[PDB]
Amino acid sequence: DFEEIPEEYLQ
Amino acid sequence: TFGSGEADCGLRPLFEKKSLEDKTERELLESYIDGR
Amino acid sequence: IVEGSDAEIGMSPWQVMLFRKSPQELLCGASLISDRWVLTAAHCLLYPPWDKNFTENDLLVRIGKHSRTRYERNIEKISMLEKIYIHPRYNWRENLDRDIALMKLKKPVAFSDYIHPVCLPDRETAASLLQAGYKGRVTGWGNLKETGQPSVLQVVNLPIVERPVCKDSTRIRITDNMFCAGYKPDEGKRGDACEGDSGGPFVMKSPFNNRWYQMGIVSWGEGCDRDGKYGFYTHVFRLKKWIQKVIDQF
Ligand SMILES: NC(=[NH2+])c1ccc2[nH]c(-c3ccc[nH]c3=O)nc2c1
Ligand code: NA
């Protein structure tokens, strides 16, 4: 359901 | 930060700042025994 | 939001989304009060009954949104939290009294036409706008029905209800740190916040200086848009000293 967000926001 | 907030708070870029009104704010203002 | 419409682009530039990292999901709404502070409902973060107790690391704050599920590249910003402060007397054991929380972001965010803070009210604005009959606005990406999730941010304008009416609609103890709003069964108008909307802002536009002030935070309700029931919100102006203390102490 939610699109993926850029990996640098998980870390 | 201190009380109240930022300084330019509550003035929306795409509306107040360009003197434009969203479609239902009038409803709010009309309920404060009308505001103007 | 039940019986609300699709908001407009940049209508609520202070609307913030609390996003969990794993599973990636919408948790609650929040509001942008300065370049570094976010305001939300404490129950969004800590609610022992249902083992909820999140920390900085489990959340992300998405600002500048409209769409609920898409990453709006070049429009929204994502921040991590530095600190979460819950009201020292938030009561999750009985009625969610003092349901307020502050989050400090890692880094400031730059404002845009889609990201801009809301004002917190002062004794006189509270005094002149928190009157029964006056309408406020609530926004969120929560459910559209009690038992149905929107694609865009939703908005609904509700009236404040007289305290006697709020207290006589529930068995829970109302305190002076909450207020309720909504139409009466007898006002042929509906609307309410619902699941997924907690933490978000209830705002009013001052006719004295045309600024939007946030008077409440979505706290609770029994079901969604049920007749005879109302939505309860945290009373921001009564918890404002607490707010100022943590923002000038930290
Ligand atoms: N009808 C309302 N005015 C309302 C408002 C906030 C709510 N928040 C919740 C809620 C449901 C489940 C988990 N967490 C919540 O905050 N239900 C809610 C209902
Ligand atoms: Na109702």
HEC sequence for C116-170 = CCCECCCHHHHHHHCCCCCEEEEEECCCCCCCCCCCECEEEEEEECCHHHHHCCC
| Residue C2 in tokens | 């039940």
Per CATH, domain C1-12+118-237 is 2.40.10.10? yes
Q: Following DSSP, what letter does each residue of C2-43 receive, concatenated?
A: BS-EE--TTSSTTEEEEEETTTTEEEEEEEE-SSSEEEE-GG
Q: Do domains C1-12+118-237 and C13-117+238-249 have the same CATH topology?
A: yes
Residue at C65: amino acid letter:
K
* Pair C118, C16: CB distance under 8 Å: no
How many angstroms separate the alpha carbon of residue C205 from the centre of ligand 1?
25
Q: Following DSSP, what letter does each residue of C54-119 receive, concatenated?
A: --GGGEEEEES--BSSS--TTT-EEE-EEEEEE-TT-BTTTT-BT--EEEEESS-----SS--PPB
> Which structural domain range is residue B32 located in?
1-36
Which residues between 1 and 36 in chain B have a beta carbon less than 8 angstroms from any beta carbon of chain C? 1-6, 9-16, 22-25, 27-29, 31-32, 35-36
d(CA C135, CA C115): 24
Per CATH, domain C13-117+238-249 is 2.40.37.10? no
| Residue C33 in tokens | 């009060």
**Which has the closest alpha carbon to C122: C247, C246, C209?**
C209
CATH number for the domain that contains residue B27:
4.10.140.10
| Residue C103 in tokens | 């989050």
Q: Is C35 exposed, middle or buried (0-12, 13-18, 19+ CB in 10 A)?
A: middle
Residue C217: its H or E element? strand C212-220
Nearest ligand to the C-alpha of residue C221? 1
- Given in angstroms, what resolution was this structure solved at? 1.9
